[PDB]
Design a protein around this ligand. Structure first.
Ligand code: OHN
Lengths: 232, 55, 55
């Protein structure tokens, strides 16, 4: 909730968005941001947990020209919901069918307009059995996610267009062991009985792991490792 | 003097966040863990900077 | 002031025990896992609360 932890790195900042999206109930989340007077959507700051196969197909097909939500973001500041009414033309109909194969059927996108002219979009998708159930859930968390859009825009605008040199991290056999167990949601005590160690032992290892990544929370560091193909 | 280590204020925010989460008495948490993790990580980050003293 | 050195010693103790936690496969549990964790929190809590009285 209000633990507005804003890091100084792209990877951690992206991990906190995925952490907050899953905590709210959303399965997938995407954050896009473009500099002031830029119109090149392929060369844009895009982060999140969308399927990598879908993101690659999306850019190769130039879907930013057909996608109705990015067109909506250039003209409005109000959200647009992934309703069948937003896909009008024939190309947008094919876009909806293929996007669903990637799992993006229900959701919404929040248009981003920064103070220095940045243009972007924050997309969140939800898994539900029907559109009526999905629409009821998104309406329940719509006010809280409305605040998340502006907080992610203000904190993300500073780290979107930098190019920091990340230093490679490597963990011991024990550290990489307790981290993948923490990634699936096991608390510190539960990892102690699985690995047959004390609870202070696993808490000591997570502290070293969090310093190696440069983070201030274990759950954020856990999803960061799987982003670089380190665990699972 | 004022050194080039704006980490003490970082620890102040981590301890104050722990100070805010400690007020929730009788609430029956993931917020407690993050508060402790931030406190340990912030204090440990200061300590690694607090050992490069060089006399 | 006489709290920063405590954090400096607690971090170096944490840093010494972190080298011992990857020099021999554990076998160094003892009181050292808890006290290293216990010492870090106490140093941050005493130092951190002192950094909030200075508005
Ligand atoms: C102002 C846009 C900045 C650049 C953003 C590039 C587009 C990234 C794709 C995106 O915005 C997520 C999205 O629109 N998902 C929709 C479309 C595909 O699946 C959905 O439901």
């Amino acid at each position: 909730f209000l633990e507005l932890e804003r890091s100084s790195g792209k990877l951690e900042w992206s991990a906190i968005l995925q952490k907050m999206a899953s905590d709210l109930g959303f399965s997938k989340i995407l954050f896009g941001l473009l500099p002031k007077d830029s119109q090149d959507y392929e060369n844009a700051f895009i982060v999140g947990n969308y399927p990598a196969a879908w993101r690659e197909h999306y850019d190769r097909a130039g879907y930013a020209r057909v996608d109705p939500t990015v067109s909506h973001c250039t003209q409005s500041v109000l959200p647009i919901f992934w309703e069948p009414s937003i896909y009008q033309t024939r190309k947008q109909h094919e876009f909806f069918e293929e996007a669903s194969a990637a799992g993006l059927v229900y959701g919404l996108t929040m248009p981003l307009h920064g103070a220095r002219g940045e243009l972007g979009a924050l997309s969140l998708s939800v898994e539900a059995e029907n559109r009526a159930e999905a629409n009821r859930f998104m309406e329940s968390v719509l006010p809280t996610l409305w605040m998340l859009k502006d907080y992610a825009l203000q904190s993300g605008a500073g780290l979107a267009f930098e190019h920091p040199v990340s230093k490679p991290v490597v963990l011991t056999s024990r550290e990489k062991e307790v981290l993948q167990w923490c990634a699936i949601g096991k608390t510190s005590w539960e990892i102690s009985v699985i690995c047959n160690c004390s609870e202070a032992n696993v808490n000591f290892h997570m502290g070293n792991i969090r310093r190696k990544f440069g983070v201030t929370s274990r759950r954020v560091a856990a999803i960061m490792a799987v982003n670089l193909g380190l665990i699972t | 003097n004022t050194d080039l280590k704006p980490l003490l204020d970082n620890l102040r925010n981590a301890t104050e966040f722990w100070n805010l989460v400690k007020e929730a008495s009788a609430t029956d948490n993931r917020s407690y863990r993050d508060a402790l993790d931030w406190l340990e990580s912030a204090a440990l980050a200061l300590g690694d900077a607090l050992i490069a003293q060089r006399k």
